[PDB]
């Protein structure tokens, strides 16, 4: 029903190796050259990646900023209101970005701001200009 274990024989393969006098040597050479081809292609990309790794030397260590740990506040200082309006102008609806810019307002408070000061800060106009970019 099936070939022995560790033995590989398919109808398709048999016909291909018995096609002529040296169809056996031909098929085995095409794969011999295919192997050499892929093997030198490996060392090529290995060399490419080695050079790319050296350009990433040091990581992003001299460019990291210390952690700002500030507690979330409920009241909106005029300052924070103005930060918000500008954050809307730059980020649109990314409430996570806006929350991070202000620093002491939670993502939900940011969404509340959008409804509370809607008319007073023409947030409709501010948002439609963000989309214009």
């Amino acid at each position: 029903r099936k070939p022995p274990k560790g033995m590989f024989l398919s109808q398709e393969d048999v016909e291909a190796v018995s096609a002529n006098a040296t169809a056996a040597t031909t098929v085995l050479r095409q794969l011999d050259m295919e192997l050499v081809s892929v093997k030198r292609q490996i060392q090529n990309i290995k060399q490419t990646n080695s050079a790319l790794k050296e350009k990433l030397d040091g990581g992003i260590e001299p460019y990291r900023l210390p952690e700002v740990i500030q507690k979330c506040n409920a009241r909106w200082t005029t300052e924070e209101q103005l930060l918000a309006v500008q954050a809307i102008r730059k980020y649109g609806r990314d409430f996570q970005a806006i929350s991070d810019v202000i620093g002491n307002k939670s993502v939900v408070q940011v969404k509340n701001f959008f409804v509370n000061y809607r008319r007073r800060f023409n947030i409709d106009e501010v948002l439609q200009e963000w989309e214009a970019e």
């Binding site: 022995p4 085995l28 490419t48 790319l52 350009k55």
Partner: protein, 666 residues
């Protein structure tokens, strides 16, 4: 098996079923009610048991009926029919046994038997036992034929058949009880030694053997399941198939490597894209940090836009730093995934040069068993007689196999040094024209009712013929002769003054340097009481080694043994013999094999007797006149002694049925 059922087994008969032959002789019983069949079967089985329990004395019908019980001993004609059938076809009272009823005073019919090998001798005894006039014509100065035994002083070594291939169902088991045969078991273990003269480690010795067995199973699969049996009109050989299978195993090895390194490039190319993304991100981070820095240099107090810039750029920087950290996370995953794949590569090669040489020994051993290059064996049929193999350990005949034919030859009319030249057969009878081998001009004529030809297939193949048939053998017979294979294997007998090898090791191998010479002195036998080593020449080597002198052959033998046991532990041999079976004009080979293009059916064709045309036109269909026996005539046991023996018994029964009439078929 044991009892009456074991007797059927020991006679190669199914204990609970009637054979085709039995159906022919007892068509009343087999076509009858089941109960009668079982009575028949028991009678048959019990009679066999009786003969088998004591094969040194003749078993008469009287002695048989005596020891039969009710209700089996009630029908005395049924018992007489069974006994007669068994005696006629040589299942009982065959070989060498003391006769209770001394041979009939006068003889009926006359048979000439060509050749006094085991097949010839077996038939001769039977025919004489049936009361026929029998003369055997042997070309050699001895009996036995391909049972040849070298004897000198205390040294005894068989140049021909040597091994009893298991007693379980072997007719030679009966013979071995009748003749003083010193049978000694063969220990299976066979340590191999490479060209350098050093043993193959149990590691490789098992890896290669298992691969050999796997390669065989694979060819069987190719034959039966993929139906790879005809290539370019030519029938596929075992050799061709093995080559193809090997090539596909080397292909798979390369296929595995290709897709493994193909896994590596795909991962390495993912890394390439990730590293590019990382370099471009570290670039934007570098610039963005500078922008945040410059925004912070603007010292307070500052308006809200200037404050926003600082905050905005702070956010953007930590956002891009979040990405890079998640990309360096992925970099570590792929980077270890590459060390994963590079750590465990697939197989480097299918078989190394060292491996392929050891595999070639296994091929040589198979070429030895079939006495022929694997490229000659039929893929489909080479092993057609596997199902009929005997059970039990293979044994050697320690006192020389010749003791068997010699014992069979006793009391028979044998013309030695008598080379048959022509066989003439006609509706009225036969004449056989032979000459004396010493002075070829001295001619003999033998007139007989029937001729039994036991000429080896090698002889029958000769072109131009060594034996002429008048009229010529029919096309169906000669085509069978051409199609069938007749192979060759040779022996080198080495007689020393002392045992320098392992006494507990029966056989050890030598691994040849090349495929071409894999058969050359590849195996050695230690079997005899005396210090005798026996070297085998198989495959393509056998035919070539015959054109090389004994001194050079023995030279190469010593070289090999020196390499294995020590250059000073191997003395000069006192006596040496080298066989040349292909050269031998009375053999022209060693024994038959199922050639590519042939089948087991050709063996049946060989066994078919020849019936001459009528003398006077319009005269009734003649009796068959020319009968055939021998190794190459028995489909289920070809190339053996027991096969030859059995074919002899077969023909003797057929001839006696023809010329003495079957009284048991009523």
């Amino acid at each position: 098996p044991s009892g009456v059922e074991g007797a059927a087994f020991q006679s190669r008969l199914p204990h609970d079923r009637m054979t085709s032959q039995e159906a022919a002789c007892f068509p009343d019983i087999i076509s009858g009610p089941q109960q009668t069949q079982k009575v028949f079967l028991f009678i048959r089985n019990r009679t066999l048991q009786l003969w088998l329990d004591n094969p040194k004395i003749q078993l008469t019908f009287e002695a048989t009926l005596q020891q039969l019980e009710a209700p089996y001993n009630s029908d005395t004609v049924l018992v007489h029919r069974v006994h007669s059938y068994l005696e006629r076809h040589g299942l009982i009272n065959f070989g060498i046994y003391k006769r209770i009823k001394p041979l009939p005073t006068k003889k009926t019919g006359k048979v000439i038997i060509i050749g006094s090998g085991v097949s010839g001798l077996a038939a001769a005894r039977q025919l004489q036992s049936f009361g026929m006039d029998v003369t055997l014509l042997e070309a050699r100065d001895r009996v036995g034929g391909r049972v040849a035994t070298f004897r000198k002083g205390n040294y005894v070594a068989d140049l021909g058949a040597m091994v009893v291939t298991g007693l379980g169902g072997n007719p030679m088991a009966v013979v071995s009880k009748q003749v003083n045969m010193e049978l000694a078991k063969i220990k299976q273990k066979c340590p191999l030694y490479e060209a350098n003269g050093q043993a193959v480690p149990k590691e490789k010795d098992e890896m290669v053997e298992q691969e050999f067995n796997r390669l065989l199973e694979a060819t069987s699969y190719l034959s039966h399941q993929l139906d790879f049996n005809v290539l370019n009109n030519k029938p596929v050989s075992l050799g061709q198939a093995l080559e193809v299978v090997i090539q596909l195993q080397e292909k798979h090895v390369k296929d595995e490597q290709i897709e493994h390194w193909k896994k590596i490039v795909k991962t390495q190319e993912e890394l390439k894209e990730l590293l590019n993304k990382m370099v471009n991100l570290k670039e934007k981070i570098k610039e963005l940090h500078q922008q945040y820095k410059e925004a912070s240099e603007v010292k307070p107090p500052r308006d809200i836009t200037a404050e926003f810039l600082v905050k905005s750029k702070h956010r953007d920087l930590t956002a891009l730093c979040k990405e890079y950290d998640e990309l360096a996370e992925t970099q570590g995953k792929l980077e270890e995934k590459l060390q994963e794949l590079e750590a465990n590569p697939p197989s480097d090669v299918y078989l190394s040069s060292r491996d392929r040489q050891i595999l070639d020994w296994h091929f040589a051993n198979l070429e030895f068993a079939n006495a022929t290059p694997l490229s000659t064996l039929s893929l489909k049929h080479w092993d057609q007689d596997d199902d009929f193999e005997f059970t039990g350990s293979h044994l050697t005949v320690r006192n020389g196999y010749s003791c068997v034919p010699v014992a069979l030859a006793e009391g028979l009319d044998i013309k030695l040094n008598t080379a048959v030249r022509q066989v003439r057969y006609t509706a009225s009878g036969c004449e056989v024209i032979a000459v004396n081998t010493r002075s070829t001009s001295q001619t003999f004529i033998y007139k007989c009712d029937a001729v039994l030809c036991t000429l080896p297939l090698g002889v029958l193949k000769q072109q131009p013929p060594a034996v002429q048939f008048v009229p010529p053998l029919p096309e169906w017979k000669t085509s069978a002769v051409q199609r069938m294979g007749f192979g060759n294997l040779n022996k080198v007998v080495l007689c020393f003054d002392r045992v320098f090898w392992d006494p507990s090791v029966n056989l050890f191998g030598h691994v040849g340097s090349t495929t071409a010479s894999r058969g050359e002195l590849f195996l050695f036998w230690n079997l005899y009481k005396a210090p005798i080593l026996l070297a085998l020449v198989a495959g393509e080597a056998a035919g070539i080694m015959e054109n090389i002198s004994d001194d050079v052959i023995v030279g190469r033998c010593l070289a090999i043994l020196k390499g294995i046991f020590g250059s000073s532990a191997v003395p000069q041999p006192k006596e040496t013999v080298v066989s040349r079976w292909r050269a031998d004009p009375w053999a022209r080979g060693s024994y038959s094999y199922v050639a590519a293009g042939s089948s087991g059916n050709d063996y049946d064709l060989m066994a078919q007797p020849i019936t001459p045309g009528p003398s006077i036109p319009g005269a009734p269909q003649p009796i068959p006149r020319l009968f055939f026996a021998g190794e190459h005539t028995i489909r289920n046991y070809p190339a053996t002694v027991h096969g030859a023996l059995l074919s002899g018994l077969r023909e003797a029964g057929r001839i006696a049925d023809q010329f003495l009439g079957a009284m048991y078929t009523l």
